[PDB]
Each structure stands twice: as structure tokens, then as C-alpha cells.
Nucleic acid binder design. Structure first.
Ligand SMILES: [Mg+2]
Ligand SMILES: [Mg+2]
Ligand SMILES: [Mg+2]
Ligand SMILES: [Mg+2]
Ligand SMILES: [Mg+2]
Ligand SMILES: [Mg+2]
Ligand SMILES: [Mg+2]
Ligand SMILES: [Mg+2]
Ligand SMILES: [Mg+2]
Lengths: 172, 100, 131, 116, 60, 59
RNA sequence: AAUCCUGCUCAGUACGAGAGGAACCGCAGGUUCAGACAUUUGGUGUAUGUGCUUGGCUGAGGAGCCAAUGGGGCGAAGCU
RNA sequence: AACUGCGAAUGGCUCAUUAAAUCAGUUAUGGUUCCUUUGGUCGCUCGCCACUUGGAUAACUGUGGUAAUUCUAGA
């Protein structure tokens, strides 16, 4: 809930910027994960959980619950010194900036995915643990690695696997 | 007299049931209307069916029972309420005058 | 959720009702009721909260020779509200809607029956008051 | 045993009796029966119909202040001291006025001395 | 229901919040500028006579 | 007596400011030290030297 | 001699690249039909019940009457 | 801070209405009203507080109410 001055004060840093976009196949919890991150951290974002957050900037986006236009939100937060210990890259301060871009996951909006990826330098690929790797994840992964993007992977909807599927740990 | 009315009144309406008389013995209250005229004998039989639905198993707790006069558009539940509302009348006053 | 209870309809096919929105239509001419399966010679009839098909008779000429969906919001027939209350209004009136449930206008003149409001939330939000 | 209603004529309308009417201008009335409803619809003023509660009240059919002299204290004073002072001795009061008179006399002497 | 009580001889008017229509019915259907018995406010308040001076609606 | 309401009476906030008011209050008959019989409020607070002041009597 | 449909849940779930998108159990109600019933709402109303009123008639008042049910308000019971 | 007094009826904007209407010249108000300015007049009238009276009410101390407003009450 900070004002603009410290936003600039950390924006001028270059070793703590993290341009990354969330990418996945349709209906993998990209919106839900981005909203949970909006609840947790954010330059001015609260912990509001009123269904879909600012990533659904449109009334028809809330009408359908399908992401249409890609949304660029900002996140700020801090992490401890022993958390800095793992950061083998350049380091300056505990504060971090995330230029988060929520990209659409539909095949018809792969151009919007490309527009997001040209901006970003890293990608959080969301994968349903139940469905595994889907067609559009197989697509956006090709796009990102062609655009030289480091992938970080996140299996989602583990509640479905451990309750609805009743998977035991061995097969999980 | 339910658990919310607590009025010391009987099921007999104001002025008695129309075309029937005064209920004094026990009685059974039934949802809805049953066949026959007034003072018609009815047989009541334990059900041939197994009652398991919510409507059949529903608990009933009456809050209020209407006892206005069925001999027209009644508007007072009891004699006590009607007297409390209307107040004294000519017949009451002249009966007081005659009997001191 | 709890569907609406059966209420006295009173408005058959051919009824002319007032138009309670602000679209510019003065009245509506009920031509049918949604969900009516029917019977021999039995005219379809609607109560408050029922979706009907109607054509406006007086009003803006860009709507007169067209069929529109509508919802009755006030009826003059007295109906029982499942608590002994026999409610009846001063007039028959309905607003113009579409297939989904949106109201064509933006304001409603006069009260709206509680059943109609509970059936259609959009009318409930647009309603000036609830009878 | 719902909420108790009252007709225009004032009688208590029990649940399941009568009929409730709503107008386009938002006003909602309740009527005990068709006689009351027809009078209301024909727009007969209830104050002339002999058997209505409004008529009875209008024709009166069926039909003091306090002055205190408290005594409390004054902020920054003593409750005992103020009553004692206002019930002081009359001889104390006349001694006070004569001692203030001679105080004014010596004030006059000071005025004369400063004049000189 | 908050009930402000003011004593002319002492001041320090106090709020008594109550939850008993049974103990509020002695004031119900009366009017202001009338003297009603505060005896229904408990045997502590037995022998107290009060007058209604003002009131606030449910909307303020 | 209920605690709070019927006890610890606060005094009247101010003294009377009219000459007839104060004379009636103190039962003075004809000019018995009305100059000094007025109420003098002592003002005390932590960070100062406490003093006392009296109002101006009119009429 | 019962009949059919809708809403909620299942579930925006299975299925499916997506778009879309169910079903079984259950819950709340309706359509059409049937058999009753009059507590309530409405209808009727010659209880010719009670007021109101036009014309005429009993000398007037009071009380009535006739006008093929004079008209009109409200209306018990019954029937609906 | 408040009661009281005064101002807030001026200024500024715009030309919609408006065709003997507005308006200009001129003329009357001996057919009227007028805070404010100024000058008059203010012991002219014979009539147990006058060394000067009664109730309060603000502001103020205190309990609040309402989601809300330059909202307000109770003592
Ligand atoms: Mg009856
Ligand atoms: Mg036919
Ligand atoms: Mg002075
Ligand atoms: Mg058959
Ligand atoms: Mg005649
Ligand atoms: Mg006569
Ligand atoms: Mg003859
Ligand atoms: Mg003839
Ligand atoms: Mg009738």
C-alpha cells in the first residue's frame, strides 16, 4: 500500500527487477494464482479475494470468467537475508519488484502471449497436476523457449488430485 | 392455547361452530378440508403407505389458531378482547341500572 | 433455491397492461406466456413475475411493430402470498426485458411485487419499491 | 401471530383475514373486509362513518408539570462553603457592609492623598 | 436498545443497553413528556419515576 | 441509588453572571461585599502556574 | 389414474485443444388431469337483512305500501 | 468560539424570453414606498426595583444516535 516515491526508488534498481509472465493452458488456475499473489504481495494491492482481481479488467471478463486481455500488474515485497543467500545472481536490498503479466491461455490469443513474452524475461508455467501437460502448455512452452525465456514450473489444483482423484502418494 | 398465544380460550369460535354446535370432547385438527357436511361421521385410518418424505415427517408447532366468528366476518378472537375493544354498551348499562 | 408459488394469474392473452419502464413505450399487449403448455380453449394467462411476449401499442414507433419479451410486475388480480395476505395492485403493469433477464429500460415507475423481484434480480435492483 | 395490522377504520386485522392493497404511488393499505375496502375505494372519509375508530376518537366516544428547586455546587467552589455563606449570619452581613463602607472611606482618603 | 438516563440532581447521564422487550413494554405505546414507572428496570430501579424526554430512530 | 447516576454530583459548570442572579443566590440584601462574594474559578494544570479568575458582573 | 416440466445441487464437474457441457441420488416448485372443500379472497344474494333514494298513494308526522324484484350501497347463511 | 448587529438584493455571467413590450428622449408622482447619509426632534403628554427587574438561551461541561450531510437530541 505504498505511495509512488519508493516505487520509483526501487524501480531505478536493476538487480531486483523480475519481468515474468504466468502462462498455461486454458483453465489451470492462472487467474486464481495471480489473485492469491495479489492478496499476498503488491505495490498497493490489498488482500481482497472478491472472485477475480484487477487481472479481469473487464465486465465481460467477470461475466465469463475467461481471461481476454493480458493484464500487467506490479508486485513489491521483501525476503530475509538467509533468503538472499540462495540468490546467486546480482543482489541489492531485500526488496523485489515483479512486473507480473497475466497472459491469456487460449490458442486464439497466442499473439497476446507473444506480446507478453517479448516484454518478459521469465515465465511461470502453470500445469494442472491432474491433467498434466496440455496442448496449450505444449504451445506456450515452445513460444517461450524460442524467445529465450527461463521457465519456472508450478503444478496447481493439487486438491483435485488428493481429494477428487484420491491419488495415494506413490502414484502422486 | 399454543406456546406463543397463552390465551385462555377454547377451539370453539366466537358464537360456536356454524351448523354444528359446541365442541366439548377431544378433537383432531387436520390440514386441509375433508369430505362431508358438518356433523358428518368420518372414519380416520392409520395410513396404508409408508410415510418417509419430508412433508410426512415434518414436525408441527402451531403459533396461533383463529377463533373469530365463522358466522360472518368475525374480527374479535374472544369475548374478553371484544369487551376490551368495544367497551360498555347500552344493554350492559341498562342491565346494570336494573340490577344495581 | 425455491421456485415461485402458484398465484392467481388473471391476465390472459390479449390483455393491455401499462409499461412501467422508461423506454418510451406507453403500454404492452400480451400475446403469450412463457412456459404455458395449455389446454383446449384455455387461454394462456400470466401473473406477477411471469415472462411474457408482448408488443407495444402506444409508444415509440421504433418498437411498435415488433415482439418483445416482458415481465409482469404489478397485477390487479388479488393473489395469496402464502401467509394469508391477498395482495392486489391499483394497475396492471410490466417492464420490457430480453431473453437473458436484463431490463430494457433503466428505471421502474411504481412498486414491484416481491415475487417478481425475487424471480428477476435485475428488476429487483431497478425497482423503486417492493410491495 | 404475525405482525399486527390495522385497517383504515382502525380495527385489528388478524393474519388470514381481510385483504392488503398496494397503490402505484407506493402506499400500501390493509382492509378488514370488503365493506371497509369499498368505503376506501369510494373515497369516503372515515371521520364521518359512525362505526370507525377515527370517528369515535374525533367525537370523543369511549373517552401535571413539575417545578424543581435543586441546589448544587459551583465549579471550583465548595458545596458546604456556598450554603454556609448564603446562610451566613445577618450580623455578619451588616458587619461586612459597614467594614466595606469604612474601606471605601479609606479609599476616599487615599484618593484625597493622591489629589494633594 | 441503548437507554440514556439523565438525573437532574447529579448529571453524569448513562447508557443502559437492554435486551428485554418484557422490560421495555412499560415504556412502549406511551409518548414523550409523560411520567412512567422505571420499576420495570429492576428492583434496583424500583421506586424510580422517569419521564421520556427524547429518542432516536433506528436510522439515527 | 444506582452507582454512576445517583452519586458523585458534578457542580454547575459556571457561576451566575448577572448581578440579580448572584444576589438572589447568595441572599444578599443591599450591597454586602458583592465585589468579592462572586465565585473565583481556580485554573490548575500541569505545565504552568495555576491561578484564579472571576467573571464580570453586569446590570 | 395419475401425467409432464422447470429451478437448485451435482457442477463450469465428467467429456473436450477450445468453444462449450451433461447424468444418477437428493431438494424446492410448477403444467395438465382427478377427487373433494368453503377457514380465508372473490362471485351470487329476494334472509326482500339493514340504510339511501325517485314517482305516486294512506289528511300530515311516525309507520308503511305499489312501480311484473322500482333503483342503488353494504350484506348473514347456503351454493360456488 | 458563540449570541447580537450588518451585509449577503451589490458585484460577475448570458442574451433564452421579449415587437408600443423592453428601451431612448421628455414629463408626472399635487397617485406612492424608502434600510443607510445629513439635519431636525427625543424632561413638551402631569402617570416596597429605579443606585436598574423576570425567565431563559447560546457559546461551554458532559451521554450519545446515524453509513452518511455545514444532521441533531437528552441533562
Ligand atoms: Mg362463514
Ligand atoms: Mg377453441
Ligand atoms: Mg454594561
Ligand atoms: Mg385415463
Ligand atoms: Mg316516496
Ligand atoms: Mg314518514
Ligand atoms: Mg293500488
Ligand atoms: Mg302496469
Ligand atoms: Mg355485493
Amino acid at each position: 500500500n505504498f505511495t509512488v516515491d519508493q516505487i520509483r526508488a526501487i524501480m531505478d534498481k536493476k538487480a531486483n527487477i523480475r519481468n515474468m509472465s504466468v502462462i498455461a493452458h486454458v483453465d489451470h488456475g492462472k487467474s486464481t494464482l495471480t489473485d492469491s499473489l495479489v492478496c499476498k504481495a503488491g505495490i498497493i494491492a490489498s488482500a481482497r479475494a472478491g472472485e477475480t482481481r484487477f487481472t479481469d479488467t473487464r465486465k465481460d471478463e467477470q461475466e465469463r470468467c475467461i481471461t481476454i486481455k493480458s493484464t500487467a500488474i506490479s508486485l513489491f515485497y521483501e525476503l530475509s537475508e538467509n533468503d538472499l543467500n540462495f540468490i546467486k545472481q546480482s543482489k541489492d536490498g531485500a526488496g523485489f519488484l515483479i512486473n507480473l503479466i497475466d497472459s491469456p491461455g487460449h490458442v486464439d490469443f497466442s499473439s497476446e502471449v507473444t506480446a507478453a513474452l517479448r516484454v518478459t524475461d521469465g515465465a511461470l508455467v502453470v500445469v494442472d497436476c491432474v491433467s498434466g501437460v496440455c496442448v496449450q502448455t505444449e504451445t506456450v512452452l515452445r513460444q517461450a523457449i524460442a524467445e529465450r525465456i527461463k521457465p519456472v514450473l508450478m503444478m496447481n489444483k493439487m486438491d483435485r488430485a488428493l481429494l477428487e482423484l484420491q491419488l495415494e502418494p506413490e502414484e502422486l | 392455547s399454543t406456546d406463543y398465544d397463552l390465551s385462555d380460550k377454547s377451539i370453539n369460535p366466537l358464537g360456536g361452530f356454524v351448523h354444528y354446535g359446541e365442541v366439548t370432547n377431544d378433537f383432531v385438527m387436520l390440514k386441509g378440508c375433508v369430505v362431508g357436511t358438518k356433523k358428518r361421521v368420518l372414519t380416520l385410518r392409520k395410513s396404508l403407505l409408508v410415510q418417509t418424505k419430508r412433508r410426512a415427517l415434518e414436525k408441527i408447532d402451531l403459533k396461533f389458531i383463529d377463533t373469530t366468528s365463522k358466522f360472518g366476518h368475525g374480527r374479535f378472537q374472544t369475548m374478553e378482547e371484544k369487551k376490551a375493544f368495544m367497551g360498555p354498551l347500552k344493554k350492559d348499562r341498562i342491565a346494570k341500572e336494573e340490577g344495581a | 433455491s425455491g421456485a415461485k408459488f402458484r398465484i392467481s394469474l388473471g391476465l390472459p392473452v390479449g390483455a393491455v397492461i401499462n409499461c412501467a419502464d422508461n423506454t418510451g413505450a406507453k403500454n404492452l399487449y400480451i400475446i403469450s406466456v412463457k412456459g404455458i403448455k395449455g389446454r383446449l380453449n384455455r387461454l394462456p394467462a400470466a401473473g406477477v413475475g411471469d415472462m411474457v411476449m408482448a408488443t407495444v401499442k402506444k409508444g415509440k414507433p421504433e418498437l411498435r411493430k415488433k415482439v418483445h419479451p416482458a415481465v409482469v410486475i404489478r397485477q390487479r388480480k388479488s393473489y395469496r402470498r402464502k401467509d394469508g395476505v391477498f395482495l392486489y395492485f391499483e394497475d396492471n403493469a410490466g417492464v420490457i426485458v430480453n431473453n437473458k433477464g436484463e431490463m430494457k429500460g433503466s428505471a421502474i415507475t411504481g412498486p414491484v411485487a416481491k415475487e417478481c423481484a425475487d424471480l428477476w434480480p435485475r428488476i429487483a435492483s431497478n425497482a423503486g419499491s417492493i410491495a | 401471530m404475525k405482525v399486527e395490522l390495522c385497517s383504515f377504520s382502525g380495527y385489528k386485522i388478524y393474519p388470514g383475514h381481510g385483504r392488503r392493497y398496494a397503490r402505484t404511488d407506493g402506499k400500501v393499505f390493509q382492509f378488514l373486509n370488503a365493506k371497509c375496502e369499498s368505503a376506501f375505494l369510494s373515497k369516503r372519509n372515515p371521520r364521518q362513518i359512525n362505526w370507525t375508530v377515527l370517528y369515535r376518537r374525533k367525537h370523543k366516544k369511549g373517552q401535571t408539570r413539575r417545578a424543581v428547586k435543586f441546589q448544587r455546587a459551583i465549579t471550583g467552589a465548595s458545596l458546604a462553603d456556598i450554603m454556609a455563606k448564603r446562610n451566613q449570619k445577618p450580623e455578619v452581613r451588616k458587619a461586612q457592609r459597614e467594614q466595606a463602607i469604612r474601606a471605601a472611606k479609606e479609599a476616599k482618603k487615599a484618593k484625597q492623598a493622591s489629589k494633594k | 436498545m441503548k437507554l440514556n438516563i439523565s438525573f437532574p440532581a447529579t448529571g453524569c447521564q448513562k447508557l443502559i443497553e437492554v435486551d428485554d422487550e418484557r422490560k421495555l413494554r412499560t415504556f412502549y405505546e406511551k409518548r414523550m413528556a409523560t411520567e412512567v414507572a422505571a420499576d420495570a428496570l429492576g428492583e434496583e430501579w424500583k421506586g424510580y419515576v422517569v419521564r421520556i424526554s427524547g429518542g432516536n430512530d433506528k436510522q439515527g | 441509588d444506582i452507582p454512576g447516576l445517583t452519586d458523585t454530583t458534578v457542580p454547575r459548570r459556571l457561576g451566575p453572571k448577572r448581578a440579580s442572579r448572584i444576589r438572589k443566590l447568595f441572599n444578599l440584601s443591599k450591597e454586602d461585599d458583592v465585589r468579592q462574594y462572586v465565585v473565583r474559578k481556580p485554573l490548575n494544570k500541569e505545565g504552568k502556574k495555576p491561578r484564579t479568575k472571576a467573571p464580570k458582573i453586569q446590570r
